[PDB]
Write a structure and sequence with these properties.
four-stranded parallel beta sheet; alpha/beta; elongated; TIM Barrel; 2 domains; Lyase, Ornithine Decarboxylase, Chain A, domain 1; homodimer
Chain lengths: 384, 384
């Protein structure tokens, strides 16, 4: 993890980093071009860059976004917003979650379109913009798919009521209506899409809104790819920009690898144990590799006696408890593993692969749960 | 997570952070003074500040270190070392894990004492020292307690030879011998302590080393507090500095809390579901608070339908899957919860406590496996 950085930018190199996240510029640009080709100019692309470009580094990723002429960017935090703007990007910038009031106030300076899900919230936010003499562009969130997270519940009369109240705020300008799908299943997306079509219709008619000044947007990566009719005015794709999307969609390239270094290989006698609480017993005279990565680097404890890594193409297993900063792996069967060798914690190496699915199985949850936190806990390096 | 920072220091505030880590200065200073008094001047104190000071911020902790005259600091990465030096620390700086060779080389500039646990590594390390015209002070790691992680196995004859080989390197100046305990258990500790004493005797004799020019150190926090005969010349304390140690040792104060904000509270009708995959069903008309923290902030997916948070001192349950950036909690029983309210994710709030124990139970591993990543993924703010 760099302790000095400038708008998402570090001064580290692979040589002086204990572990690093490698981000492929050309995989990114390929996935952008692919998505653009799939939209075929019928819908527009908004790149979802929350969680610091999903752990890829918003400051690394932005120059590709600008290069490919992407017109819309979605972020979550104020620092992400600040970095988007400092990169020169001048287009539509929207937050894809509710902000707290004081967080929202601090982001007025970035001309961000803010998300609104409540009459009370809308009232509070309206007062903040009034105080600063700004008109704040807002996307009203609807609970059409049923996340019950950011959105107003338009399947009740109370909801429709809050929705009119929201449209009555003098210093808010409603520029969009959105929802978010709760389940990556085509049937369930279509149920949600039908609900979203009815509820936006109802609003636009009954609150006398201009359909032509509104961007209607519902689709994430899955929906965009699997349910074209969910494309509407604009799509919000995160995972597919990064090659983390529908497994069958192999036209999207993986933009990230997670790597470290062998510091040294050591000889340990049979009967020796490894790591805290001695959870692994050596059944033969071993050679153990000491790798400069641990759970403080996001290589989570749960990988204890479960993980595999790649060195020189070989699939080598983790032994003992993962330490804070150090990981032991068994290279008894791989005499070619040397101090200085590159390790692959996630990705591909010379014919070997550590897969998304093997990691999700160990972790008990989706990979973004690990990689968003890899990206924070280690320096990112743009390659390709 | 700040995307600009200068030597572990950021320009963010509680008011513009979606979530943050509060580090208590006075807890840190209390813990140092207590440690020092307990060591009663009989043994040297080396503050282990690995993993960005265990998630507390090495740039935030250093001034206390310097002021209380701690003479030794232990770190893992080059950035930590760089920061320790930038803060005006001029004393003994030791790495407590093996570095890779190019990592080690980039660190020469911080006059850090390096760990060594191999003849091969030693020779390799000898050659870099040579090439740079430096004598590198080294600590030699011994596998006395059987971590089988960093140290030479002195329980074998090849081990002993490797050891003697290490002491033979012309550009390496051995200043210390160390080991690390594998089990937090008094008896297990004494077993390892007896072995360390024998094996250090053996080595001092056979290498003809000046005992009085050597520091012997084995003890971390548990050993230091629980087995005083393990204190030797110098201890290496991590958790105790931060109040994460033996649960009965309550003289050490918790230095960290993990907090966030309520963005808004929403109404949703019975039978609505919450979050991705609809994993929680509202059994009553509900008020759901939207909290601006998620797994990309280190609030791990495992807390789904499991975590509790504090708002206005109330113990409030997490409902649904934790999103990347947003967490939903049920505030139907708690009408005093409003947009703006401060949420405690870990720590104390007005009579409520989210404990180390309860979080370790949901996580399936020790709390450091969470908080070192909280610290990377969020702004650290110094209080008290």
């Amino acid at each position: 993890p760099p302790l000095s950085m400038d708008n998402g930018t570090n001064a580290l190199t692979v040589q002086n980093s204990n572990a690093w996240v490698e981000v492929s510029a050309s995989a990114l640009q390929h996935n952008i071009r692919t998505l653009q080709a799939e939209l075929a100019g019928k819908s527009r692309l908004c790149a979802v860059l929350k969680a610091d470009a999903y752990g890829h580094g918003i400051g690394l990723v932005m120059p590709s976004i600008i290069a490919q002429g992407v017109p819309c960017v979605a972020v979550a935090s104020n620092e992400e917003a600040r970095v988007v703007r400092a990169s020169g990007f001048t287009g539509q910038l929207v937050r894809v979650r509710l902000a707290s009031l004081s967080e929202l106030e601090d982001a007025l300076q970035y001309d961000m379109e803010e998300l609104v899900g409540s009459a009370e919230f809308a009232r509070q936010v309206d007062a903040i913009a009034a105080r600063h003499g700004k008109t704040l562009r807002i996307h009203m969130a609807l609970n059409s798919s049923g996340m019950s997270r950011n959105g107003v519940e338009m399947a009740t009369w109370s909801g429709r009521g809050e929705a009119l109240q929201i449209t009555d705020q003098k210093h808010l300008k409603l520029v969009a209506l959105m929802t978010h799908f709760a389940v990556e299943d085509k049937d369930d997306v279509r149920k949600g899409l039908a609900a979203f079509n009815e509820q936006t219709d109802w609003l636009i008619k009954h609150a006398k809104l201009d359909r032509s000044k509104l961007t209607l947007h519902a689709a994430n990566s899955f929906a965009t790819l699997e349910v074209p009719e969910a494309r509407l005015d604009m799509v919000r794709t995160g995972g597919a920009l990064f090659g983390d999307t529908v497994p069958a969609r192999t036209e999207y390239q993986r933009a990230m690898q997670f790597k470290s270094h062998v510091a040294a290989v050591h000889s340990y006698p049979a009967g020796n144990t490894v790591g805290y609480d001695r959870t692994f017993t050596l059944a033969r005279d071993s050679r153990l590799a000491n790798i400069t990565v641990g759970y403080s680097d996001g290589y989570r404890r749960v990988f204890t006696n479960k993980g595999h890594v790649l060195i020189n193409g070989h699939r080598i297993p983790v032994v003992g408890k993962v330490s804070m900063n150090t990981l032991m792996v068994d290279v008894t069967d791989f005499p070619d593993v040397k101090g200085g060798n590159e390790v692959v914690l996630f990705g591909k190496q010379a014919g070997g692969e550590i897969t998304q699915a093997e990691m999700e199985e160990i972790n008990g949850a989706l990979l973004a749960d690990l990689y968003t936190v890899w990206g924070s806990s280690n320096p990112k390096i743009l390659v390709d």
